[PDB]
């Protein structure tokens, strides 16, 4: 089935593999990705640019 080369493990059920790399201690060892909330202006740029990219 699914294969994780980082841990070199064989993930059987699609959901079993989906719940490894999202939470993998070894993969997390490649960098702490704790997402901090950006500034109030940061959430405005993503709203503005998408209004000009998707629509326009």
């Amino acid at each position: 089935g699914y294969y994780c080369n980082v841990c070199d493990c064989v993930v059987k059920d699609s959901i079993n593999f989906l719940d490894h790399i999202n939470g993998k201690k070894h993969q997390r060892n490649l960098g702490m990705s704790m997402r901090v909330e950006r500034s109030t202006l940061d959430q405005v740029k993503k709203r503005f640019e998408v209004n000009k990219k998707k629509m326009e």
Binding site: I15, L18, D19, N22, G23, S33, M34, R35, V36, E37, R38, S39, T40, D42, Q43, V44, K45, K46, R47, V50, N51, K54, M55
Partner: protein, 176 residues
């Protein structure tokens, strides 16, 4: 890891930070296809990208409780716990619809009743269509008024239970 918000969160007084939804429904929200993707991390910006690309407004569908991406995204933003300014920014966006819908729903779940009326009242003017998923899977196109009316007046307009907003008469007698 979907336990804490980031490291510390101002706990909503109702039940808990993550537990404003029923334990069964949140436990179902986690194990899901839509959660498997985008659970890598969504703090402030990618939430906007994931919100403008889901034109559904609903809760659970199917015999097996299947969460809509609307509902799972509400829960994801609930775990993220954004600041009030970002939520007012989502509540002020008129171009993208379901983004504003999620902003209103979150401001209802986490927010002061005074703030609830102050930010959700002017969302009671849009006479546009909104798609929703019924419990049997079949979709239905309704009015935005129906949504905000069930949200502000009715209980559990979606699968989530609402945190008991006062009657408006008490606040009209005491405040604005």
């Amino acid at each position: 890891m979907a336990n804490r918000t980031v490291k510390d969160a101002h706990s909503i007084h109702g039940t808990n930070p993550q537990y404003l939804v029923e334990k069964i429904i949140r436990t179902r929200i986690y194990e899901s296809k839509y959660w498997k993707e985008e659970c890598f991390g969504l703090t402030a910006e990618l939430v906007v990208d994931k919100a403008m690309e889901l034109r559904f407004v609903g809760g659970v569908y199917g015999g097996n409780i299947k969460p809509t991406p609307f509902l799972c995204l509400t829960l994801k933003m609930l775990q993220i716990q954004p600041e009030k300014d970002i939520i007012v920014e989502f509540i002020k966006n008129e171009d993208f619809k379901y983004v504003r819908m999620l902003g209103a729903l979150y401001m209802r779940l986490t927010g002061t009743a005074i703030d609830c009326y102050k930010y959700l009242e002017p969302l009671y003017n849009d006479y546009r269509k909104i798609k929703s998923q019924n419990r049997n899977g079949e979709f239905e196109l309704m009015h935005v008024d129906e949504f905000i009316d069930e949200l502000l007046h009715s209980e559990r307009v979606c699968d989530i239970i609402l945190p008991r907003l006062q009657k408006r008469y008490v606040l009209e007698e005491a405040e604005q």
